[PDB]
Amino acid sequence: MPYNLPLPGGVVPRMLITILGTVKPNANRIALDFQRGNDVAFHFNPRFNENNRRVIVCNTKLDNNWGREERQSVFPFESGKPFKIQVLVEPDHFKVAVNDAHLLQYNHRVKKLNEISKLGISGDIDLTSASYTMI
Ligand SMILES: OC[C@H]1O[C@@H](O[C@H]2[C@H](O)[C@@H](O)[C@H](O)O[C@@H]2CO)[C@H](O)[C@@H](O)[C@H]1O
């Protein structure tokens, strides 16, 4: 939707990625796509209305096939409101916090973290900034 944050050197433990923005009015979806070639190592997809239920769907795409979805009902996003998403990389999983509160963790399926060269940021949001640092 369709911005891309380059991750030279790929993903590595201790890396902290921060995304700041504002959810658009009447938002329908948001998506973060950690890409490794044509695969999607980590797909973070907040859905504002899936049968009148809000849900965050996470999955991985390998060789054009989506794997086992990991769903989370806790949904801190709100249409028209600013947000902050922080993705902390651990050797065994991606740690996600929103508005400074832990939200979920997604265990790595794609093991070669170094090959995850970019983070796609899309969906119904107004992007302020996307950056990363080491902690
Ligand atoms: O898993 C992430 C992936 O989901 C796709 O939609 C799924 C839907 O969530 C699932 O309930 C249904 O059984 O199959 C659909 C197709 O795989 C999204 O289209 C895709 O963009 C990702 O969000």
Q: How much distance in Å is there from the Cα of 134 to the middle of ligand 1?
A: 32
Pairing outcome for strands 70-72 and 55-62: antiparallel
H-type helices in the chain, by residue range?
Answer: none
To what resolution in angstroms was this structure determined?
A: 2.0
Q: Are 10 and 115 in contact (CB under 8 A)?
A: yes
Domains of the chain, start order:
1-135 (2.60.120.200)
Name the phi and psi angles at 69, rounded to 5.
-75, 145
Deposited experimental method = X-ray
Q: How much distance in Å is there from the Cα of 67 to the middle of ligand 1?
A: 9
Residue 109 has a CB neighbour count (10 Å cut-off) of 14
Q: Are 10 and 113 in contact (CB under 8 A)?
A: yes
- Amino acid identity of 123? G
Is residue 69 part of an annotated ligand binding site?
yes
Q: Identify the CA nearest to 77 among candidates 108, 17, 31, 129.
A: 31
Is residue 35 part of an annotated ligand binding site?
no
